Each structure stands twice: as C-alpha cells, then as structure tokens.
Design a protein around this nucleic acid. Structure first.
Lengths: 94, 136, 75
RNA sequence: UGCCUGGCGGCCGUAGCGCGGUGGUCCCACCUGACCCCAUGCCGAACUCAGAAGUGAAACGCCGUAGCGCCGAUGGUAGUGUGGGGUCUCCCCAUGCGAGAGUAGGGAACUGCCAGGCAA
RNA sequence: GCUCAACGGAUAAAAGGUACUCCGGGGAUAACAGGCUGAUACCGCCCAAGAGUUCAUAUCGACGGCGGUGUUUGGCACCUCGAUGUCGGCUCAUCACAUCCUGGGGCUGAAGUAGGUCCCAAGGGUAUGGCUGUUCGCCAUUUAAAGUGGUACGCGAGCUG
RNA sequence: UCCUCCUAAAGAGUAACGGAGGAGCACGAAGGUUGGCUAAUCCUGGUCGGACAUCAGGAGGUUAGUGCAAUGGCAUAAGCC
RNA sequence: GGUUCUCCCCGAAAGCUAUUUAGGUAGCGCCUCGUGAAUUCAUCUCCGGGGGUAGAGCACUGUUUCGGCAAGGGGGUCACGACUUACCAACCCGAUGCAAACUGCGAAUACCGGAGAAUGUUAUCACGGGAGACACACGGCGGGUGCUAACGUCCGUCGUGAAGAGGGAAACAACCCAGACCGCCAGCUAAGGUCCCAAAGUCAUGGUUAAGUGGGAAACGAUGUGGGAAGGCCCAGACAGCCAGGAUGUUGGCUUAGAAGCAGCCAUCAUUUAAAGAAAGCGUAAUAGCUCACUGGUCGAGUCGGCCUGCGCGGAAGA
C-alpha cells in the first residue's frame, strides 16, 4: 500500500534543494528504461514513517504524480549524516 | 592505547577539522555510537570508552572500533620559550567530524546495548547519539 | 637540525596555448619531460622546450600513453 | 562493389584481457638446409642467406560470448567566487560555478591510402 | 694561487676582563609591578569501575570528561630605561567568601559526649615565644579559633636595612 | 653558501631558532655515434644449494634500474651489452 | 633633541635583494615633475590555455579495523611413503577509515594569450630631474608555530589605520556606514535607531518567553512551556486510587559450611486456576517479614512511554 504523493520539481540546484528541505520536503529522482529521468518532490514525514520497516525496500512501490501512477523500486537513498532525515532517494522504474 | 607503528614522519601540521564524516553508517555490527559534535579524541579517551562497554556487556558480543588516532600531537615543556623548533610528540588523537560512527557492537539485546553505549559516551568529549543498522 | 632550503628554480609554462611566439623562445621549463616536443619544437639538454619556428603554440595529447605534446603552427 | 590478406597511418582502453569457434586458393606464420654472406661474450636460439616438402599445431587475422578492465549519465551531495548573517576554533542565507565516488546504462571498435588473390 | 665555508669575500696580518668604570641611546629589548592569556596550579561539577561487614553515591572514588577563579609556576613583550625603590619586620589597615571560631540546618556506617560530609551565614573575633634575614617551616605552651586570598606578592614623600 | 620535497593557499614567487634529507664530487670513460637487448617479485622441476647463488618454464608488466639525497622524467628507452 | 610666513595641486612606504648587516645604507618596488609614444592599460562578454589546491579516493607510498581462503610453522597417527590439528601465521579476496612531505580522479577562483562594445582627464609604457621609505598595526579569509592560548609570533591575499574627519557600537586608531573645497536656522537617506535621559512608532497583525531570561559561560540534569510526526492500551470500559488474592515441593541437587529468589554454578519444570513467578526492590548469618510483577469488584473516561525540535530553569563563587 506504499502510495507516495509526489510533485514535479520546478527548479533544481543546491540552493533550491536546501530551500526545499527547509520546508519539510525533500527531492527524489526516478529513472530507468528508455524514458527521461523525472525529478520529483514529496513530503518527508510520511516517507520516514513508512520507510522505517525493513520491507520498504523489498517490493515495488507506486508513485502518484500529477494523476499519473508509476511503479518504482528503491534503488538508492542518502541519509542525513547525523540526523534522522533523508536527503535524496533514487527510484528505478519497474 | 591505540597508536600506529613506524609512521613515516614523527610530526605533522595542525591542520583543520572542517568537513563532514565519511563512515556515517553501521557496517559491521547491529548498533553503533554516532558522533554529533566535532572535535578530536585522544588514545586515552578511546581506551577508557572501550573498557566501559566491555565491562557493561560482560564480555558478551563483539566490539568494533571505527576510529584510529594516527595523528601525533606535540606539547612544549613547562617553562619553555616560544621557538627553538617543534615540540616533542606526546599523544595521538583522531579527528572526528559530525556523523562519524565511533564504536560498533553486535550480539547483545537492544536494551542492554543502549546503556552500554550511554556509559561510554559519558567518557567522551563530543556529543554522541545511538544508531541502529539500517537495511540498505 | 632543520632550516635548509634551495633557491626556487622558477619552472613552469612560460608561453600558454594560443599565443604567438618567436623562434627560439622558451615555452616550458621543466625538470623532466612532462610535455614532449611536437612539431617545430625542440628539446634542450635540461628538457627545456623552445620554439624552432615562429607561430602559435598549442598543447595536445597523443600516443598510446596519452602523453602531452607541444606543437607550433605557422599562423 | 563485396568476403579476404599484407604494409603505412589516423585514433587511442566503448579500442584492452579471459573463454569458445573459425583460416590455407593467394598472402602470413611455423618449417628444411646453411659450404659460402652474416652472428652467438656458447647455441642457425636471435640475426642473415639458399629453399619450398609439409602444416594451420603455436603465433597472427576474423566471428561469438560480458566473465573482467574500460566508458558513463540524470538527480543529489561535497567544495567554491561575490555580497550579507550567526549560539563564529565551524556553519547558514541570496546568486554564480559545480565535482569525486556511486547508480541506470553503454561496451567485446571505427576510419584513410597502397598492393595482392577469389567471386563479381 | 684563497673550507676569503661569517661562502657579495671590510686587513696579507688580531683573544679576554671590568662589581673602578665612562659617554651616546632604547621601554625598538630583559629584571619588580600592571596588562593579555590560562598550559600549569587551585576550586567545583559529569560518568562510574571499586573500596566501605552485604550496599557505587555515610565517607573515598580509579580509567576518562566539562567548567570557574586569576591566589602559584609559566607564555607574550603592550605600559614605564629624560628612573614605577622589588625580600622580611614594625605601625595602620580595608575588601572578597572558596568559613578557622561563634550562629542556623540536611544526611550519616548520627546510641550519648565527641565526629564525618554538605548547604545557608562575612556581625564580631581570629596567639605568645625558641631557631633562622627569612615568608615559609620545625619545635615549646596557650585559646572558641590561632581561616584562605585581593589590595604595585597593601603600606620606605610613615619607620628599620 | 649550494641542491630536493613539504609548508606555499592548482601560473611565478613567498617567512619562521617550521617539518624532512643531501653537496664542496666522480668519469678519458660512466662522453659521442652505430647495432642489439628489456626488469623487480612470485610459482613449479633440478647436486652440493639451504628462505635467499646459477639453469628451464610460467604469472607479472617496471613494484626494477637509472655512479651519489630527494623530486620530476625515462620503452623511440634517459635502463643493459 | 630642535628646525621659524601663507596658499594651491598630486601623494607614499614600512616590501624584495645585498650588507661585521639587522634602529644604517645601496639597487629595485611604491611617490612627484617634465618629455615621447602605440583602442598602450583596466573592468565585462566570448574564445584558446597549462595546473594538481579545496573536495574526493585508497591503484601506488605509508598507516588502520573486521571476516574468509588460508602456503607455511608446532604438537600428534603412521612405513625412503605420508597424515591430522582445539594451535601460530605470510601473500591475496570482501567491507571500513586516515595522510603537508600518497594520487589510478579533480573544481571554484587566480594567472597568461586573442577578439569585441561601452566607460575612464593616458588610468599604460619608455627616458630624464627630485624624493621619501626599507620599526608597521589591527580586521576578514587560507595557513605554519603556540595550547585550533595571547591585543603572541611568522607568511599569502584584500580592507582599514598609519596619512580620514563625519554618523553608529555608552566611552573604544585599526569593527559597521561613509571619503570633509567654503557658506546656509533647506530637503532626502546609509549603518544604527524611534517609552524617558535623547532626534524619531508607548505603530499594526500573528506567535513565544515568567526566567529581569532579554542584559556573560559548558559537559550534564529535570512531569517548565509551545508546536510537529507517529505508536501501545482504551465505554466487550483504559491510567492513577479504593476494601481483595499473591499458595503448595523449590530448607534443591549443586562449591552439602546456609544461601531457600534476593553471592553464583543452573535449569529457568509442574498443579488450583478470576491469578501468580522455581523470582524485581527493602530487610535477616540464612530464615522470617513487607512490596511489586500479575489477577477480581465500584466510580470511570482518556491515558501511557519515546523521537524531532522553539523559548526558558539549574549547573553559575572574588576581592
């Protein structure tokens, strides 16, 4: 039931991403296949709650962006160095 | 008293402790002590913390040390004027950046692990936190 | 027992890519051969690279070892 | 024009290694002999001369295979120029530049001139 | 033809003492005091292995950690070299409290007398002699106690030397 | 006094009684040219011989060597005959 | 040490090299006046450049932790054959780090060259006349040294002072704003400010703080208080209270000195069951004993333990 609400990022960069994280929202990327990579933004608190369990990285996940459903798998993720937070998530289209 | 063997040079520059820690994840055990603050740990402090946990766990499980001093520090003798060359090496310290995992541990219950790490952190000069091995 | 040093030899590139030079001008001063002589470039006994003809100096990478070469084109 | 072959290059690991297959009409290699030319700090090993019996074993060329090397995004991160701020032996904000490693993936080449054989 | 190596080489040719000292300068540069700093020192706290009949925390508390004071030993050379007399003693003091006594309390491995430790408290009080220039210290005998420090290591236009 | 590295902040230069080491030569060949050659370290077999002499094969591709400390360079070898 | 009238223009340095040289001096750098010269020079855009610094990495030179394979080494069964191992361990493989004197990678800036527009009193270069200066200081950034101490000391680069008044930081060369030709009882602003001293909001909206925090200080401690994300148990009725229960061998074999649950070898059994463990605290030489784990009944509705943090409290003693 791993449904993630995501939005398409408007601006990218170190300044934009840091500003985004300050608003309790972190970026992520979806790639794989012959489709262009898609940059997304999504809420941080919800992902932390549902990524705590060990099987979050086991099966496929569904990403809902602008009314479109994408099936992805957790490929890579970056933690905060010394805080319980997330910096980025890499998603591989399944 | 951790210390290197036959180091290339006896003395080295003071340097700086800027930057961010690299070994920020648990790699050997199931629980670890992460460094929140920034600073340096001497060999004596590392030994004191290690002894505290070994006693706390009562030689049960495994202990991993993820930091090595590998950095000499000098100190001028008392009543010595400035100059006349670099001071003699006294003790070895390890530079710690935020997020560095100091000690790792495995083979004990989570409850017993928390108190063991808490005792060790009480004998260290840097703010520390308890972390658990993450799945990927 | 320290305190000794040697006078700096002021090595390095004297003429950079894309600037005209006169024949015989020094292009690079080096201990070994970091750059190898190319076309219209000669190598001195101390591995100094000098221009054997008048023109524009350019750098390039050639050979199986990707070693750097300095050439001169008559422009 | 094509399959081939040899030489001289461009280009230089997407081009290099490992495993399997494939080639003797020419060419190439191995190969016989060496009294003479030539050489071994001893040896036809290597170099050189007189040959072409035999062979494709080795080497070399080509094909297949990702088992390695190699190349490699997007995003994020580190760092950083300029101007400001802070609980200022370290950081943050606005703007500009933006890695390294890693990931998806790519990948077991391409090309110019000359000469020779076969089919055209 | 020169370790003219003090290596741009003042002569071919050259070591010491001055508390009997002198002159020109310098706080550009030391010694006393101030200032900055706080390694060291002193004081307080954190963790707690252990000791304490068993019981870590009555009382001590190792291995380690974090602070305060500017009371020692230090670092620097900012002030003073057209001069700030620098150890003790005497006389006269004044302030801080990290309290020696007296006052009020908690805990005690506090039966009582007598203690141990911690908290609040600076109102007042807080020795005399022998030895030594001594501060200090040892010793003798008293007291409720003979407190610790700051004040140019208080005080020589107040005294002694 | 001179040489090499770091400090030195990716041109040059850049101080300290800062951190490490060297030189006051050598060579008529160790120079010039022509021709030829390509190491260290490991594995296996083999008298003395043994971990470590020399021989043969294999992996390796320069960890070797370069008259002298260090840095840079060196397969067209600047290395060896 | 001192060096005597006035006005106008420009305007430094405290660096390098050498010096019986270090507080002197010489050349150069920097200043001034004159002369002659090229879109000479500067900023910006674009283009052509070589770096090995920050960062990163561990192929190499060193260092470092763990696991495996493990040649080899010791003790042991063997009859010149040969074998095992509770035990030492090389080289490699997998993972994790570190380095000014490590680099299989590699910026931002800076620097050199070329083209172009605008702008600048030729701001550039060469030659000539005259100099001063060669004690620098603090601040930001990158470092060595020291204790990542010093208004310490030694370098690189920029700023200010020196040689710059004015406003601001209570006072305070070097901090922030800003470069004073003279006059005006004119206006608008910068940093910083607007209750009074003292010029200007007792201004507006939404929050926080109870501490005189604001208006010094840490490790660490705590039902201070605000917000956020969750999680367990909850009218088949939770949490705290209230009259209740908590027993039988397990005085154990074990080191029988007694540990019997309250020193440990040890299992961590088993019945009544609305319900109980062969045991968490206090207390005995051990006993005993008193509580809590857990379980009934009434009222009865929320309650409980952690994470993220905003602002506060203690820690906090000097003449």
């Amino acid at each position: 039931m791993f449904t993630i609400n995501a939005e398409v990022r408007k601006e990218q960069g170190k300044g934009a991403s840091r500003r985004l994280r300050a608003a309790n929202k972190f970026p992520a990327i979806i790639y794989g296949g012959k489709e262009a990579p898609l940059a997304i933004e999504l809420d941080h608190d919800k992902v932390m709650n549902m990524q705590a369990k060990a099987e979050f990285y086991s099966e496929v996940l569904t990403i809902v962006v602008d009314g479109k459903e994408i099936k992805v798998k957790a490929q890579d993720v970056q933690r905060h160095p010394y805080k319980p937070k997330l910096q980025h998530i890499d998603f591989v289209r399944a | 008293m951790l210390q290197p063997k036959r180091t290339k040079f006896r003395k080295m520059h003071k340097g700086r402790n800027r930057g961010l820690a690299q070994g920020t994840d648990v790699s050997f055990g199931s629980f670890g002590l992460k460094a929140v603050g920034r600073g340096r740990l001497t060999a004596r402090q590392i030994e004191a913390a290690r002894r505290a946990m070994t006693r706390a766990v009562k030689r049960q499980g495994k202990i991993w040390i993820r930091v090595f001093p590998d950095k000499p520090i000098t100190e001028k003798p008392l009543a010595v004027r400035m100059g006349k060359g670099k001071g003699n090496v006294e003790y070895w310290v390890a530079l710690i950046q935020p997020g560095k995992v100091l000690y790792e541990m495995d083979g004990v219950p989570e409850e017993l692990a928390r108190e063991a790490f808490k005792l060790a952190a009480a004998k260290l000069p840097i703010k520390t936190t308890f972390v658990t091995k993450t799945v990927m | 027992r320290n305190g000794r040093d040697s006078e700096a030899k002021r090595l390095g590139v004297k003429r950079f890519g894309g600037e005209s030079v006169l024949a015989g001008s020094i292009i690079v001063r080096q201990r070994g051969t970091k750059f190898h002589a190319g076309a219209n470039v000669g190598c001195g006994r101390d591995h100094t690279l000098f221009a054997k003809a008048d023109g524009k100096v350019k750098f390039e990478v050639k050979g199986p070892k990707n070693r750097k070469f300095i050439s001169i084109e008559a422009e």
